[PDB]
């Protein structure tokens, strides 16, 4: 286990045996792909192979090393104000839970229909000094599940978190991180959906009727400062203890908007990664 | 234990067995609620149920995950002064122990008549820079039980704490936290009371005749600085190792004042969460 | 207490590390995990399923479907050539393929590979193509003889319909790079007529062949990296 796990030799690939010639009836190279199945032909079948003892692990080819990597999924921003502190909808951020809200990683999952996981969340606040001294800028992140009082503005009553989670980070002390159970009323997170809100010819349809999990209302606790700032707290996300069901063809068209598939670009012709050739004859 | 405790499957709910029809005498659906007791009827009784093996824990429905969550119960503030340092009743805070001093969490307990617990106290000082440089602002929190010399002003003789508790926090070093035994001369904390100070038709009556536990006299040790500040040290509180006796109906009227039940708003009609319907016939 | 020394790396953050974190939401017992038909556990699996190949990688064709078919024609001449593509699995036409699309998530690849072709011809129709794998070393062959000299498979179109061509693994370095590299050049594969396409009366004289590529149990990848085949020259709205 150790060795196998430390040496990373858990999932090893078979070796390529030796072959000889075959002047025989059954032709393995011939199958009818219309059966929708996949061929089973190998080196040893087609050629006069040798003998190679392999030693490549398919460890890094596991839904956990494919998925289990932290990725920017949101960049909370706060261009503070000292003029009006508090006021409605200010100096505090709120953002709806999700992804589809950002490619590269969105891309990645979408490779599967259903998915399930606990996550390694990490907050990377970066304090840009627009003043001659930033002081001590404390911070409060927290989670607002449904249906819950989402701060109208900066000091509601909801920042008491008498029964909510609020993580606090003060300049110097390291990046806040933490983790989380798999939050869904369903046995898995619906990375897609072919359902609607209802029969209302104006109902919602997508990944989304099924993902009302939150939002995040933010706060820079410290009170009024002299010299201004702007905070940019980056939100990274990692999938730990993941499972996946029914793979899908990757995405080749740059999306737009989340919780939707829509590609149809604003005017520009739909572009894809495929390159053009002069002729099939020369590559 | 582990698994059951790590998997959080300690308190599991029964499953819904299968039923068949009943053309029989005893009618479980009929009971007389006047007995003050509660009915005992189930799915299986009323319908022709199926068979569902459950898997929901009532773990998070425990007086410890209901109560055991940190909540703002006080926000100590100090608008420093450099003009007059010391002086009487300045630059040092003192506040009486309690709650009722702040909703959301006050609300929460009040759900029970009696309560008992040890607590996870955490101090979240936030230093607002009103100057061009905050220096090194050290801090001293401490606890003044009854009857004890409560600092008249900033440097008494009581800040020697020769036999008292004073926690010290210096800008950078993390949030001060600590904990505490259940402090009451009584076997439980009286979250209510129907008693008075005495027969004096001017005696006190409430939660409060029974809660003379303290106060907190504060201090910013550092001496005189140049560039001003304002400190806001937030006081969060968590209930660990809690017990509760005789549940009560929750509160629906926004209170006012603590250690009292009084709702009677200043003029405004007494408002409650109930919404109005046009008709009972349509919901 | 424990006289400790804080090591250099301490306090950092890596998008690639295995560490625990206090779980907010203590005491939460997640929805049970019901049974669901078809769950993956390894990219590999997806890599072993043959996905179709864009090969008619030509001009107007490209944004359409045709971009997938290869019509086997007339051919006045004889011993003439059909097409060619190069093996470097991250190279349009390959790339976009379930495999390619993937491989482009890792820095290095290895093992054998499988190319399969199918005759969307007729029943009464007949043909015989010669497919070949020209290992890395020289130039994609200009002529059949020259190409027949290396690895190949004669394909007899018949009641079967699908011929699968294997691409042995020939390389110096146990491993090849997924990224375009003159060194790690995997070679070319090409197809030519062995005989012709003969059709008895009143049958069309052009027909198509679809082509595919799935992996071999040989196969394996490594060094995960972010993809090539997708630039989010967005953002993404709401």
């Amino acid at each position: 286990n150790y060795i196998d796990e430390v040496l990373n030799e858990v999932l090893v690939v078979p070796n390529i045996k030796e072959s000889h010639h075959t002047t025989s009836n059954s032709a393995p190279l011939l199958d009818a792909a219309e059966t929708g199945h996949t061929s089973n032909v190998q080196p040893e079948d087609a050629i006069e192979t040798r003998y190679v003892i392999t030693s490549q692990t398919r460890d890094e080819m596991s839904i956990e090393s494919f998925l289990g990597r932290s990725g920017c999924v949101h960049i909370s921003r706060i261009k503070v104000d000292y003029t009006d502190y508090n006021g409605q909808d200010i100096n505090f951020t709120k953002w709806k839970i999700t992804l589809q809200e950002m490619a590269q990683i969105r891309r990645k999952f979408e490779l599967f229909t259903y998915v399930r996981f606990d996550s390694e969340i990490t907050l990377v606040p970066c304090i840009a000094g627009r003043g001659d001294d930033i002081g001590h800028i404390v911070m409060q992140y927290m989670y607002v599940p449904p249906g819950a009082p989402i701060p109208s503005k900066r000091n509601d009553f909801s920042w008491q978190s008498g029964t909510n989670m609020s993580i606090f980070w003060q300049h110097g002390q390291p990046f806040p991180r933490f983790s989380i159970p798999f939050l869904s009323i369903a046995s898995a997170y619906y990375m897609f959906y072919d359902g609607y809100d209802g029969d209302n010819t104006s109902s919602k349809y997508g990944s989304v009727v099924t993902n009302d999990m939150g939002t995040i209302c933010s706060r820079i606790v410290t009170e009024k400062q002299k010299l201004s700032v702007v905070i940019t707290t980056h939100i990274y996300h990692k999938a730990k203890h993941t499972k996946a069901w029914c793979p899908r063809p990757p995405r080749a068209v740059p999306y737009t908007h989340s919780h939707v598939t829509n590609y149809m670009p604003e005017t520009g012709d739909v572009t894809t990664a495929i390159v053009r050739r002069n002729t099939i004859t020369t590559a | 234990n582990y698994i059951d405790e790590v998997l959080n499957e300690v308190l599991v709910v029964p499953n819904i067995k299968e039923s068949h029809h009943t053309t029989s005498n005893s009618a479980p659906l009929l009971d007389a609620a006047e007995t003050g007791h509660t009915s005992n009827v189930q799915p299986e009784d009323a319908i022709e149920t199926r068979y569902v093996i459950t898997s929901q824990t009532r773990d998070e429905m425990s007086i410890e995950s209901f109560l055991g969550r940190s909540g703002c119960v006080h926000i100590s503030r100090i608008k420093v002064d450099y003009t007059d340092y010391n002086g009487q009743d300045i630059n040092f805070t003192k506040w009486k122990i309690t709650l009722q001093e702040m909703a959301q969490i006050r609300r929460k307990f009040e759900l029970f008549t009696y309560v008992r617990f040890d607590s996870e106290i955490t101090l979240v000082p936030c230093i607002a820079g009103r100057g061009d440089d905050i220096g090194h602002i050290v801090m001293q929190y401490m606890y003044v039980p009854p009857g004890a010399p409560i600092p008249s002003k900033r440097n008494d003789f009581s800040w020697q704490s020769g036999t008292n508790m004073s926690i010290f926090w210096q800008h950078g070093q993390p949030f001060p936290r600590f904990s505490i035994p259940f402090l009451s001369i009584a076997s439980a904390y009286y979250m209510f009371y129907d008693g008075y100070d005495g027969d004096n038709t001017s005696s006190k009556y409430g939660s409060v005749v029974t809660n003379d536990m303290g106060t907190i006299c504060s201090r910013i040790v550092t001496e005189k600085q140049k560039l001003s500040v304002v400190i806001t040290t937030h006081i969060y509180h968590k209930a660990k190792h809690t017990k509760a006796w005789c549940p009560r109906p929750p509160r629906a009227v926004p209170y006012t004042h603590s250690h009292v039940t009084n709702y009677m708003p200043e003029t405004g009609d007494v408002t409650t969460a109930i919404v109005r319907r046009n008709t009972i016939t349509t919901a | 207490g424990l006289p400790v020394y804080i090591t250099p790396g301490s306090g950092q953050f890596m998008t690639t590390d295995d560490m625990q974190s206090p779980c907010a939401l203590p005491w939460y017992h997640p929805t049970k995990e019901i049974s669901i038909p078809g769950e993956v556990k390894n990219l590999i699996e997806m890599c072993q399923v043959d996905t179709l190949i864009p090969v008619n990688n030509v001009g107007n064709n490209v944004g359409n479907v045709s971009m997938y078919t290869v019509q086997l024609g007339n051919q006045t001449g004889m011993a003439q050539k059909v097409f060619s593509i190069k093996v470097d699995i991250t190279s349009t036409p390959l790339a976009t393929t379930l495999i390619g699309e993937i491989a482009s998530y890792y820095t290095h690849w290895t093992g054998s590979l499988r190319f399969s072709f199918m005759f969307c011809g007729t029943a009464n129709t007949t043909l015989k193509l010669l497919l070949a794998y020209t290992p890395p070393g020289i130039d994609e062959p200009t002529t059949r003889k020259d190409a027949m000299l290396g690895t190949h498979v004669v394909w007899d179109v018949g009641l079967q319909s699908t011929i699968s061509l294997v691409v042995p693994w020939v390389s110096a370095s146990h491993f090849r790079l997924t990224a375009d590299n003159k060194y790690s050049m995997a070679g070319y594969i090409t197809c030519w007529y062995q005989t012709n396409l003969v059709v008895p009366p009143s049958t069309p004289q052009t027909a198509d062949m679809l082509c595919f590529v799935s992996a071999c149990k040989d196969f394996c990848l490594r060094m995960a990296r972010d993809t090539d085949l997708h630039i989010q020259s967005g953002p993404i709205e709401q």
Binding site: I180, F182, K240, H241 | - | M19, Y28
Partner: peptide, 19 residues
């Protein structure tokens, strides 16, 4: 060094294993 789930909950733990 391992299996020392310093934290109570299971959701908090390292990347799972392989089998």
């Amino acid at each position: 060094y391992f299996n020392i789930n310093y934290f109570k909950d299971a959701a908090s733990s390292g990347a799972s294993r392989l089998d």
